[PDB]
Ligand SMILES: Nc1ncnc2c1ncn2[C@@H]1O[C@H](COP(=O)(O)OP(=O)(O)OP(=O)(O)O)[C@@H](O)[C@H]1O
């Protein structure tokens with residue numbers, strides 16, 4: 001006997017679900033991209049990297065009120081010196097990979 | 104006789120190839136925007 | 139050692155496994171073969187379905203025992 | 215056919231729908247009835263938070279069942 | 291009044307220096323041509 | 339149309355809860371939800387309040403997931419207190435009192451779901467021995 | 471680290487490493503060896519006796535009852551190898567430099 005044509009119901013239900021989903025993500029990476037474009041704008045202070053630093057979370061990290069920045073980033077953190085002679089700590093670096101920054 | 108799936112599977116495979124790599128493009132972009 | 143697997147499409151597969159491997163791990167390996175999400179997969183041994191947390195050896199699956207692999211729609 | 219939804223104000227809403235309707239179509243109907251941005255609204259049923267692409271059919275929903283609607287919330 | 295340092299190439303961005311405030315990365319306006327702005331000359335810059 | 343006589347009544351319990359929660363999150367802007375009833379078009383009562391879990395951005399917070407409140411709003415009705423929600427609050431430590439340019443946006447949808455909604459703000463470090 | 475809107479303490483941190491002293495700590499490609507420095511084989515020992523031994527075998531001096539010298543200066547006319555000696559020591563002694 002020839003049996004279990006269920007594959008076709010498997011098949012097409014996949015085909016549509018994938019095809020639309022991909023397209024939707026294509027849109028959002030488009031949209032979010034222009035969002036980034038508007039943060040850059042133009043005037044930028046210039047400054048020097050003083051440091052490159054590596055810190056780890058607290059022993060307990062509840063949800064509730066908790067800050068998703070001062071802890072729970074696995075990468076480096078930095079310290080910078082502005083031209084106006086201020087020093088700032090940066091718990092996250094931004095649009096640049098730390099692997100290519102040096103004091 | 105029934106062999107229906109094969110060709111469409113290949114189509115789905117190309118879609119898989121797209122979709123998986125597209126998720127990479129998504130994740131990194133969001134990792135920028137959230138910052 | 140390897141098991142055999144027979145799909146509804148008539149495809150026969152010969153998968154090297156450990157008998158101590160969990161059925162969920164075997165289904166993950168099958169997904170590794172062909173992307174097939176484990177939730178869609180159903181494994182039957184000699185007419186008995188295999189529990190996710192089951193090993194292979196729990197009914198002593200060995201030596202080219204042919205599991206039937208069935209595909210189903212799924213969604214919560 | 216027709217389906218219900220309720221929300222934390224005690225409000226109920228009734229939608230003419232079909233099982234083929236997608237979740238995004240449902241969200242669209244909700245906005246058409248009330249104007250809420252589809253990204254601030256979120257839907258729950260069976261303890262599961264919804265996603266756009268699935269449909270009433272594959273969500274296993276049946277006549278006049280009542281969904282829960284809930285709102286996005288942030289400071290800033 | 292500021293003193294220019296250098297000019298990044300093609301579509302241009304410039305580096306600006308003032309003698310007590312900081313340095314900046316800036317651009318031009320519509321009324322100035324990109325030809326007569328050679329590096330190493332004092333220029334006028336808006337306040338905001 | 340709206341008027342200049344509407345009055346908000348708050349219980350003691352909401353007060354102590356809000357003060358404690360706001361003071362615990364002292365460097366940052368915590369969040370919470372408040373519930374009660376509109377007894378008439380001139381007066382509104384808030385009876386009780388419960389906190390909410392967030393992941394905090396440096397500037398502010400967003401409610402992490404709505405399953406929590408979907409559970410809570412029926413978990414407690416097994417013990418009376420069937421009231422519906424009426425508003426929300428956040429704390430500004432030492433800044434003063436106002437709605438930011440995004441707090442307004444959050445209030446927009448609360449009002450779109452129910453036109454009588456309210457927002458509340460508190461200052462837990464400037465309030466001393468009175469005059470909270 | 472202080473929050474810039476209210477200045478409340480947020481974290482403690484380790485001490486600075488001033489970037490000049492970082493660039494001083496590990497910048498040397500030189501790789502010369504004592505085979506490449508002829509004819510001052512005794513001054514080499516005279517310096518090694520100061521910097522190398524009391525760093526690694528300190529109880530001898532304790533037994534005799536003295537504390538080793540802390541430092542020395544190399545002097546002489548131009549071109550007699552004063553920097554080459556230090557390059558060789560730096561390349562072939564395991565320490566911090
Ligand atoms: N004793 C030596 N053996 C081998 N090469 C030497 C010797 N003395 C000097 N040189 C050569 O001198 C060159 C560099 O000189 P060096 O760097 O030692 O200067 P210096 O004697 O410390 O001078 P200055 O006092 O001006 O710093 C190299 O080519 C090195 O081979």
Ligand SMILES: [Mg+2]
Pocket residue numbers: 552553
């Ligand atoms: Mg020299």
